Homo-oligomer: A and B are copies of this chain.
Amino acid sequence: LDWLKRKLFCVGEDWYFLTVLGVLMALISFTMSFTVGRVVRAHKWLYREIGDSHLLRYLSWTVYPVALVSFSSGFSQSITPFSGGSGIPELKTILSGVVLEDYLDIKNFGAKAVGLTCTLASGSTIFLGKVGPFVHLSVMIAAYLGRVRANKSKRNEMLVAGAAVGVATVFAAPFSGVLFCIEVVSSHFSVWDYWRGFFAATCGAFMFRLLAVFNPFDLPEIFFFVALGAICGVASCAYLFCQRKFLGFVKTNPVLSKLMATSKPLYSALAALVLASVTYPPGAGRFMASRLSMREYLDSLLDHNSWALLTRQASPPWPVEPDPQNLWFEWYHPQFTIFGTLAFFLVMKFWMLILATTIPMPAGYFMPIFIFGAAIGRLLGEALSVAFPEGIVNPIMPGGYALAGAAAFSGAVTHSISTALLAFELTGQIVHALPVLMAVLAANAIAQSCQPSFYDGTIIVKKLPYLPWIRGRKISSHRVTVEHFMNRAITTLAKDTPQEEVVKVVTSTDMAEYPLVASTESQTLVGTMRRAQLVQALQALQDILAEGCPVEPVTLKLSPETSLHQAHNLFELLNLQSLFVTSQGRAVGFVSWVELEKAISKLTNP
């Protein structure tokens, strides 16, 4: 009985906490969504109602989002510099090895979630998703759980799982979300982590369900898809470049920096204001399809009907409010053809999207990218339709094309072909399986050969302590050997040395693991000793050895001339905590994680 209970406990306990976390995440997503939704509705109502006078309308359009943005900023600013505007990259960094304790603290939670919610409410004017922040939150929760329960590896795994769950929840999409997270965040992942993530996602889905009460492709087609993917990749590279440079400029340009220092919220507010005017439905949004929710846009993009043909058949009417059945009517204009409108959107979102990303607040930057990709895809589809009105020898459905574009562009941006999978999941259909995937792959090829990932770019801009190789990031990763960053301080307990001396040493340092040396002159290692054990022995060094104190031999030895990178890799893979250094056999020093972290920091920031 007791034995059985014991057996149940560890594994079961592990499972249970994860499940709980998942549930919590689901709850957060539901409640957050609800909070968003009502606000959005209210805003819409206000827009409808305030009147026919222009100024008032403008104010309604412009003020509400601005205020929200400001609110988001303010909460972020008060706690710490690395709180707001950071999720995935930070997580990645953590996974790589260097720990930023500021990131995992729970005092930060309440201020960030609210900000995220505000951002969401602000919606399609500001044009931002929720992912990264959500992921961060999830990770934090996981960390908290771990702490409550209370090795590094296990903790890391837990964090990963949490992240995966977070990703799933935002997407409302279990199977692929976790995979995507794994692709983006980590490296040296295990299947069990993935499984855990999946489980969490499933739990979240179940929770959502529970809470529901409240509330045949041809051969040229493939070619076309590939072309689309390529185009996306091209575009994505450019986008990535823009992201990299704009952020740098912001960091750099002195006046802007000064302004930020004075008031980040002010900067954010200003940005919002700038966005809002451009958006404004009757002035310029009639062209940009402005008057739409975030999901609404996506829906419009991935609509089954082929727009150009429809337009040709019949001029669509501009309604008072956007039709729930016919979202795509928003994209049409008489003077500017649907194609033209799409082009305009592409031009303008790109211009704006970067700016939006820049502004300091808790916000996600995946969904917008996806939407952009979809738009591009749709344009291509439309073009194809125009070319071949009959179709290819079944007609060309541009929805599929749009979907492919969304999959592809996002993947290119993110360096992750899990994007395709995610897209498929969202769709609900696995009939577009190959071509889309191929397109995504193509995009990745073109993007990952030229540029770093969005996330990677962001990390570079930050100068966060992430060791691995990134494209377009000049740094001395191969040069720094162990000699430069190793700890020269050692506590050599040689056989030959007297007992009093040893005692004194013990009294002084009290290190976790003392090195055992052959003799004082040679300084050559013959294994290691633990401190507590030594103390015990003393209470009760050749003499000591004779008496019978256990010599745990050194399993693995680094040279001083070995590269930092290699060492780091070793540390990551074998799950080590410390490791000694030998030069011609001599105990020169002692590599820990701390030293490595320091080195990384140095590399990042001169």
| Chain B hits for A183, CB < 8 A | 191
Cβ contact within 8 Å between B554 and A11? no
Which of A199, A417, A556, A563 has the most CB atoms of chain B within a 10 A radius of its CB? A556
Cβ contact within 8 Å between B569 and A174? no
| Chain B hits for A542, CB < 8 A | none
CA–CA, A255 and B526, complex, Å? 55
CA–CA, A436 and B66, complex, Å? 47
Judge whether A605 is part of the interface by a CB distance below 8 angstroms. no
CA–CA, A558 and B557, complex, Å? 6
How far does the Cβ of A211 sit from chain B's closest Cβ, in whole Å? Answer: 15
CA–CA, A244 and B531, complex, Å? 46
Cβ contact within 8 Å between B584 and A556? no
Cβ contact within 8 Å between B555 and A556? no
Instruction: List residues 149-181 of chain A with CB under 8 A from any CB of chain B.
Output: 174-175
Cβ contact within 8 Å between B585 and A526? no
Per-residue CB proximity of A551-564 to B under 8 Å, as 1/0?
Answer: 00111111101110
Judge whether A314 is part of the interface by a CB distance below 8 angstroms. no
Cβ contact within 8 Å between A202 and B585? no
| Chain B hits for A555, CB < 8 A | 558-559, 561-563, 566
Instruction: List residues 259-288 of chain A with CB under 8 A from any CB of chain B.
Output: none
CA–CA, A174 and B433, complex, Å? 10
Instruction: List residues 202-250 of chain A with CB under 8 A from any CB of chain B.
Output: 202-203, 205-206
| Chain B hits for A15, CB < 8 A | 441
Which one of B417, B430, B526 lies within 8 Å of A584 (CB-CB)? Answer: B526
CA–CA, A570 and B574, complex, Å? 7
Cβ contact within 8 Å between A206 and B584? no
Judge whether A113 is part of the interface by a CB distance below 8 angstroms. no
Judge whether A116 is part of the interface by a CB distance below 8 angstroms. no
CA–CA, A182 and B192, complex, Å? 12
Judge whether A525 is part of the interface by a CB distance below 8 angstroms. yes
| Chain B hits for A584, CB < 8 A | 518, 524-526, 585
Cβ contact within 8 Å between A203 and B434? yes
Judge whether A449 is part of the interface by a CB distance below 8 angstroms. yes
Which one of B556, B561, B563 lies within 8 Å of A559 (CB-CB)? Answer: B556
Instruction: List residues 414-446 of chain A with CB under 8 A from any CB of chain B.
Output: 417, 430, 433-434, 437, 441, 445
| Chain B hits for A16, CB < 8 A | none
How far does the Cβ of A24 sit from chain B's closest Cβ, in whole Å? Answer: 17
Cβ contact within 8 Å between B202 and A433? yes
Instruction: List residues 347-378 of chain A with CB under 8 A from any CB of chain B.
Output: none
| Chain B hits for A434, CB < 8 A | 202-203, 205-206
Judge whether A477 is part of the interface by a CB distance below 8 angstroms. no
CA–CA, A546 and B331, complex, Å? 76
**A569 closest partner in B (C-beta):** B574
Judge whether A189 is part of the interface by a CB distance below 8 angstroms. yes
Please state the number of chain copies in the assembly.
2
Assuming the contacts A205-B433, A434-B203, asked whether A553 and B561 have C-beta atoms less than 8 A apart, the reply is yes
**A573 closest partner in B (C-beta):** B573
Which of A191, A524, A553 has the most CB atoms of chain B within a 10 A radius of its CB? A191
CA–CA, A525 and B434, complex, Å? 55
Cβ contact within 8 Å between B574 and A199? no
Judge whether A586 is part of the interface by a CB distance below 8 angstroms. yes
**A12 closest partner in B (C-beta):** B445
Judge whether A582 is part of the interface by a CB distance below 8 angstroms. yes
**A203 closest partner in B (C-beta):** B434
Judge whether A195 is part of the interface by a CB distance below 8 angstroms. yes
Cβ contact within 8 Å between A437 and B561? no
Instruction: List residues 454-474 of chain A with CB under 8 A from any CB of chain B.
Output: none
Which of A527, A554, A555 has the most CB atoms of chain B within a 10 A radius of its CB? A555
**A175 closest partner in B (C-beta):** B430
CA–CA, A183 and B190, complex, Å? 9
CA–CA, A281 and B570, complex, Å? 62
Judge whether A7 is part of the interface by a CB distance below 8 angstroms. yes
| Chain B hits for A297, CB < 8 A | none
| Chain B hits for A191, CB < 8 A | 182-183, 189
Judge whether A198 is part of the interface by a CB distance below 8 angstroms. yes
CA–CA, A557 and B15, complex, Å? 40
| Chain B hits for A441, CB < 8 A | 15, 199
| Chain B hits for A205, CB < 8 A | 433-434
How far does the Cβ of A241 sit from chain B's closest Cβ, in whole Å? Answer: 19
CA–CA, A294 and B342, complex, Å? 53
| Chain B hits for A566, CB < 8 A | 555-556, 574
**A553 closest partner in B (C-beta):** B561
CA–CA, A585 and B587, complex, Å? 10
CA–CA, A582 and B11, complex, Å? 41
CA–CA, A191 and B417, complex, Å? 10
Cβ contact within 8 Å between A582 and B557? yes
CA–CA, A7 and B449, complex, Å? 9
Q: A556-B559, A584-B585 are in contact. List 13 more A-B contacts (CB 8 A).
A: A7-B449, A206-B434, A524-B584, A553-B559, A553-B561, A555-B559, A556-B556, A556-B557, A556-B562, A556-B566, A556-B570, A582-B585, A585-B585
A sample of 11 inter-chain contacts (CB < 8 A) reads A7-B449, A195-B417, A526-B584, A553-B562, A555-B558, A555-B561, A556-B556, A556-B566, A556-B570, A573-B574, A585-B586
Could you tell me which A residues sit within 8 Å of B by CB distance? 7, 11, 15, 174-175, 182-183, 188-189, 191, 195, 198-199, 202-203, 205-206, 417, 430, 433-434, 437, 441, 445, 449, 518, 524-527, 553-559, 561-563, 566, 569-570, 573-574, 582, 584-586
